Design a protein around this ligand. Structure first.
Ligand SMILES: C[S@@+](CC[C@H](N)C(=O)[O-])C[C@H]1O[C@@H](n2cnc3c(N)ncnc32)[C@H](O)[C@@H]1O
Ligand SMILES: [Zn+2]
Ligand SMILES: [Zn+2]
Ligand SMILES: [Zn+2]
Lengths: 167, 242
């Protein structure tokens, strides 16, 4: 009974991401130059400076925590193409005690919001902040869509090395 | 649950975004050409059997385990066949199994051509005679390709197809690989070679010369039997593709 609406200003970038990963065999520069942690902190800072002074910040930080948790729990299993799995294994091996929110960046964060609705409506990891995240995700997506130009780009992708195809 | 062991599900974009892209109904059409990527040729109604098989090439496996075998001194290479991995005396040092071993050059970058639409470049230098990538698509008959051409395909201006000698056509309009974006040059730097892999015909791209990183991959359209319907830049440019 929950479905997340991706902004219309973001679907062409999802098409570009699918084309760059599955059909052009390119890879996102891991670790990201700006990881999910820094993006969430940027969103928090952008939400602080507004009309309501201090009477919204607790929920903002809690929503950031929920977003980071769902990303860290869904990345390696649901937010990965088949071609990115060797890169994921190498990232896990080289950086074992590093949550995915420190490694991946904007495109995988976006990919989270196309499948999180399955876990929110059926296997929520926290039922105490479930209703808050449902309230805030359709504005976090608007923030992402407003910053799409600086967050999503083909510059962060590189052609995969020839030894990668052997995995 | 909360508290639930996830099961690996490969990511694929949702149906609506795919339907919006395929029907040009989104905020803006992404600079992405609609084609289905395949790993091997799809035999629609004909199988491009080469007519023959390979043999044992008598090539002497080099003492040094790193020297490549069957390098321009092989019998199978003289009949355009790839050595069977369980009969080639060179064993695991055989150089004449590039296609079946899927040994691409993984330095290919797509880009928007200047007056040709799409193009492909290499992000790494390539020695001469090196194997690039196989031209993938649907292996169709002459009659089936005429069907698809006259009553199904509208963009005849840029035909996504390569021809096989036996009247068969490798149609890459709907399904194929990146090799469908390689355009034409009267003075080419690559070449399309037909090989007998496991008794079936395959087409591969090979370097006609040494080339540094950043050059566009081009091959001659006239030397390959199909253009039944130009601004390359060469000095002796043939004006139009033909
Ligand atoms: C199989 S497609 C190759 C990729 C194609 N250029 C594209 O944008 O998708 C072949 C078509 O590319 C175009 N083309 C090839 N060489 C060209 C050139 N030198 N100048 C302008 N167009 C060219 C021709 O229209 C031809 O039909
Ligand atoms: Zn040999
Ligand atoms: Zn051999
Ligand atoms: Zn020309």
């Amino acid at each position: 009974e929950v479905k997340v609406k991706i902004p219309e200003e973001l679907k062409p970038w999802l098409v570009d991401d699918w084309d760059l990963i599955t059909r052009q065999k390119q890879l996102f520069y891991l670790p990201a130059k700006k990881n999910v942690d820094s993006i969430l902190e940027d969103y928090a800072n952008y939400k602080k400076s507004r009309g309501n002074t201090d009477n919204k910040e607790y929920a903002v930080n809690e929503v950031v925590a929920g977003i980071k948790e769902y990303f860290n729990v869904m990345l390696g299993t649901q937010l990965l193409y088949k071609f990115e799995r060797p890169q994921y294994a190498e990232i896990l091996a080289d950086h074992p005690d590093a949550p995915m929110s420190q490694v991946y960046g904007a495109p995988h964060l976006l990919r989270l919001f196309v499948r999180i609705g399955a876990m929110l409506a059926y296997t929520p990891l926290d039922e105490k902040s479930l209703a808050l995240l449902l309230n805030y995700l359709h504005d976090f997506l608007k923030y992402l869509a407003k910053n799409s130009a600086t967050l999503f780009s083909a510059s962060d992708y590189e052609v995969a090395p020839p030894e990668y195809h052997r995995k | 649950g909360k508290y639930l062991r996830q099961k690996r599900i490969d990511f694929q974009l949702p149906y609506d975004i795919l339907w919006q892209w395929k029907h040009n109904q989104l905020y803006k059409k992404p600079d992405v050409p609609l084609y289905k990527k395949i790993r091997s040729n799809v035999y629609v109604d004909v199988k491009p059997l080469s007519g023959y098989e390979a043999t044992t090439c008598n090539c002497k496996k080099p003492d040094d385990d790193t020297r490549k075998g069957c390098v321009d001194d092989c019998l199978n290479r003289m009949i355009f066949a790839e050595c069977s991995p369980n009969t080639c005396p060179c064993g695991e040092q055989c150089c004449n199994q590039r296609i079946q071993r899927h040994e691409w050059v993984q330095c290919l970058e797509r880009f928007r051509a200047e007056e040709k639409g799409w193009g492909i470049r290499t992000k790494e230098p390539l020695k001469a005679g090196q194997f690039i990538i196989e031209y993938l698509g649907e292996v169709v008959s002459e009659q089936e390709f005429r069907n698809r051409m006259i009553e199904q395909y509208h963009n005849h201006s840029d035909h996504y197809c390569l021809n096989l000698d036996s009247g068969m056509v490798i149609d890459s309009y709907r399904m194929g690989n990146e090799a469908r974006f390689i355009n034409h040059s009267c003075d080419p730097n690559c070449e399309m070679q037909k090989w007998s892999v496991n008794g079936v015909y395959r087409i591969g791209l090979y370097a006609l010369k040494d080339m540094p990183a950043g050059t566009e991959l081009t091959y001659d359209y006239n030397f390959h039997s199909f253009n039944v319907e130009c601004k390359c830049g060469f000095e002796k440019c043939r004006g139009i593709i033909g």
